[PDB]
Nucleic acid binder design. Sequence first.
DNA 1: TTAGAGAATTGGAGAGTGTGTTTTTTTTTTTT
DNA 2: ACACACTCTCCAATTCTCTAA
Lengths: 372, 353, 545
Amino acid sequence: RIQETQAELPRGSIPRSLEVILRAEAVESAQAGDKCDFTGTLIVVPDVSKLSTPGARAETETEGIRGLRALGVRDLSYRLVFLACCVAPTAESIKNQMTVKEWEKVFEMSQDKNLYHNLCTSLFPTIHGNDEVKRGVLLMLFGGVPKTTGEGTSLRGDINVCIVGDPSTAKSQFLKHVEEFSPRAVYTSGKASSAAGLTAAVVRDEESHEFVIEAGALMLADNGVCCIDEFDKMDVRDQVAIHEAMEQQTISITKAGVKATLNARTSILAAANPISGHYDRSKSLKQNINLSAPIMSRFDLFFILVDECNEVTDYAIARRIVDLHSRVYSLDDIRRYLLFARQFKPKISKESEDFIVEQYKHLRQRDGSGRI
Amino acid sequence: SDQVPVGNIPRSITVLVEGENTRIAQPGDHVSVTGIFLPILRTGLLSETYLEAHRIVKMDFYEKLAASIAPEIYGHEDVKKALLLLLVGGVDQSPRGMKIRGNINICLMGDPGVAKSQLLSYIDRLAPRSQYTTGRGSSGVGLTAAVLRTLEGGALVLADQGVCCIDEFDKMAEADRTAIHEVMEQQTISIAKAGILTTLNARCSILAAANPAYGRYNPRRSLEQNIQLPAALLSRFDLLWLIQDRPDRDNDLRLAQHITYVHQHDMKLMRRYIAMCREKQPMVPESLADYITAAYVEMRREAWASTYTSARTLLAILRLSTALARLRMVDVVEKEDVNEAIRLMEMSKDSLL
Amino acid sequence: VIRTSQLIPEMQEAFFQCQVCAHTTRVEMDRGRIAEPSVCGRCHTTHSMALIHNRSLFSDKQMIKLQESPEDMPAGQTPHTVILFAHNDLVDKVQPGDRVNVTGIYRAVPIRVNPRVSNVKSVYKTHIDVIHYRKTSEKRVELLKELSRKPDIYERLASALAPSIYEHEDIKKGILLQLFGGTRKFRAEINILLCGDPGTSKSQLLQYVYNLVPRGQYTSGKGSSAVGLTAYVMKDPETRQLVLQTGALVLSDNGICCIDEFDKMNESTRSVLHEVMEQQTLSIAKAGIICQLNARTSVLAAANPWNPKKTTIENIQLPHTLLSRFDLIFLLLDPQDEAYDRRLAHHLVALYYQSEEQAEEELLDMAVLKDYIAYAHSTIMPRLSEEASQALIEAYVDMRKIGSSRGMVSAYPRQLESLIRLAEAHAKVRLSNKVEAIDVEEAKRLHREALKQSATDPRTGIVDISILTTGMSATSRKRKEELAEALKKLILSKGKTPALKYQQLFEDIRGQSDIAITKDMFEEALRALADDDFLTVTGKTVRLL
DNA sequence: TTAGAGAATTGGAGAGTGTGTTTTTTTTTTTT
DNA sequence: ACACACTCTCCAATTCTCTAA
Ligand SMILES: [Zn+2]
């Protein structure tokens, strides 16, 4: 069943709808919510319930036609249907899509010097300062290899990143910018716009007064990136559910009529406000923010953003803004290169183990001397 | 209903009207029918019946008229005049769509058990076209129309070219408040038969009766704190009156003597007077407009110095003065009409204290 | 009109083909009866001819339902209805709710007792067979060019709005600038908020401007409203199939949406409104439907609590997350001025004698203003100048400097966007393809006036930006902090005890304070000290950490 | 050569038979 | 009580054959 698209509906009118019929190789190529162009013919279909045949009988403010032998003393009526012969939207895949130009570009990128900074500049050209944040958020896109232990338990792949800052400054820009760049990503907030919110919920379906699930933001963001704004202010119901979703990458439900396990495999980038709006530069992050220790311990990286009214900096920011309004690598190069890079699965070397265990031991004894 | 034997449900009969007998009967009307009683043709031995109809048969002046309203009730002299002008009405000005409506609307705030029920029922009985309802949302049909298995009913609908009275207004729900709000603005309503957006006339004036949230009215608190309807719709009424009363030996003895006497042992002229006098639509000259301007700005100066005054106040003054001009057999408003309206709206505050 | 059916196809000429030998024949048909062949004339085999549905010839029909209009009814009765059939050319010319005059043939038909049986009832059904129905430029460009070249055109166009309102000129200018808007990354359109007492003329003003723009919409934040702000899915009353109902915000895309009783909308409505105003799109995921919709709409809202001791956001219900999105905010209340009342009453008296001698002139100016706006919107794109760039940078620097005396922030990029949008709109009002210092100085004037009225702390007479970014004066913040420190000192002075009674602490504080501290203030201080890991509140007992 | 009467085969006009056919109480989740 | 599907019968139309006009 299809409906008039938002562009066609004449003002004040109710939408019209039509029944479309698909056959053979075209079947199950369109899902509810999709917008597509169909090619075919308009046809007329009779009321089959009032015809009679040697094989099967008839079943039984307008009138139909009369006077056919097969119709007896009943009357026959028609309706309109559209028979569509075609429908279209309105590892090997990389080898198929990349021409020699794309291969040369990813090779040049692989051989590039200070590629890290070049990609930071290319992906975040509008941003000023704050290189550490740019390096951190850039690494999140490359993820980490997931592993399954022999007894069947599994080890987490995605990293999670958190940014805290004053409402006047940069933290919102990163979220909306990476969301505009990235494929298959979701933007939302702790003050969510639906009954489901950040994780699945149960609703009663009035077609049977039967209980069914409804997806939250972290279910839809499966196999993608999730951006959450104003994370310091969030519902308790979701906050408990997030404990499992952050590490186990799954959601579990057990209520009347519904019992299920749902996937939530996602990289989260969270943005939050400190208490009293401006960050107290004299105090730790843990004193400044609203989050509890169990949630806070989940993230792999943390960053702080806070303003001060330096005249030259303000003047430079203003000139940048007005100049932008007055007007190395493209985003598609970054996309193609990122999809190329994510096929590698590097191992750790034997010698790297000694450095890793040493650094962790150094960190642990430092913590013990003045938790990790 | 009075013919039904004790503890029973009333019955009904189908009547078929044909030929020159059509269009006589109406819904809700008393009738006497002559006919033949017959069984219905099939297309068991038990069969339905109906009545085949052969004939259907249906079953000065200002002070005098003011004193004629509710003479059973002592005092309340100017309240009776306010109700008189509620029945007479003002004028719909209709200047090219910049509408000012003529219907008066008022509300009475009563202490527990006070005499307002007698006055209310007197106006209900007196008025040539009117209806009554109560805000508790009883098991019957509501303020608006309803559906059964065609559309029917509704107190707001059944009073149309007349006045409708609401009792215990303070117990209304949000549905009731929104319905009253819509009637006050558009004087029409909507009820969905089967999802279709049907709409229906409700042209009548409204009279409201309300009681404080707890006990007697408290003069140390505002009327909004006492009665607790929202101020937006509560301030629509042209006049507000607090009906407060308390014991006294002689007045209680007089009342008791009257009640025990009653237990132991011309409306046609009034209707004709309001019929002939309401033909008038008196205008105002520019001199009266200037006079009203001066009076209104002085009144608002005192109002803020002593606020409640707004454009609604000016339109109320216009309505009551034009209504009095209609009560006279005169083609225009005059100074005395404005002065009468001014003292009536002014003195109404005294009832709250 | 009440309801209109889907389009119905109707037979005209049947096409018959022989199964045995493929011979074909056509049958012109007789008042609904088809003369089916008994035998194929070519091959002489009986009962071998078949009707080919999609080779037959068809026509269009539609069924329309109509009701008597409310004016001509008997008092207190419900209305009557009739059914109309319209063929060929006329088959789609009316929609529900509007009103028509119709001419037709009054037909009558018998009806069958059941679909199988051939008996008919003795009382017929009637309908109307429709025949006709009726519903009840270089010169303009040159006039617009001359009018735009006239001086004080900005004031004149603003003055043309809402003639019933005699004094609120700068508010009219703001509304005019919203109607003109910026031009196309960043949100180019403008959002405005009106605040103050109920019963003021703001709702009339919304209804006035709603009637000026083609893509306009109007609704209320109350649940009783006629159309919702939220999109949803429901069953069609006719077919009982699902239909997707988009909300007013989506329908008003590239248009103006007027919202009334904005202050008392619920939290879910606030959330979806926040999403729409930030992202300019709306997201849906229900009943198998998953999609994203364009919802780039201009919001104009009217809100309510007056109390001069507190700023607007301190009086009304809504959060700073939403209030900080409007480009300008205005407050409407009575001035307690004798001359203002005299002029208002005089204007009202003039309106009482309102007459065609000036109503026609106002109507003509309204039509010309619609043409002016449509022309300007159709072609004009203001672009930056060096003078405007310097003035805008200086305005941002002024706002940063205003905070420097207090050692604090008092400007951020969103304020500069509001100035740019207002300057572009003012440039477009002048029909200028350049935004220039003329626009920026007026934008600064409007922004400064709006800041003065919206963001002044009445406790000091000074604009406090933290009101607009946190919901309270800095006075409240200082008082809360001082209360928390006093509470901490009181607990420490009794620190030999591990648990202190809630009521005793309230009485101690209230016995030592000059302010009459409330239960909410005391509990907010306790919550602050709990977030600081100094104490835990266990019911009626406060315990130390 | 053209046409009518007596005998044989076959189509279908017609009859008979069998069968079908809004309005109330209680639970569960999440909104308040 | 009022419609399909099926089965079955008897009456007389169409052609063969022999004969007269
Ligand atoms: Zn054939």
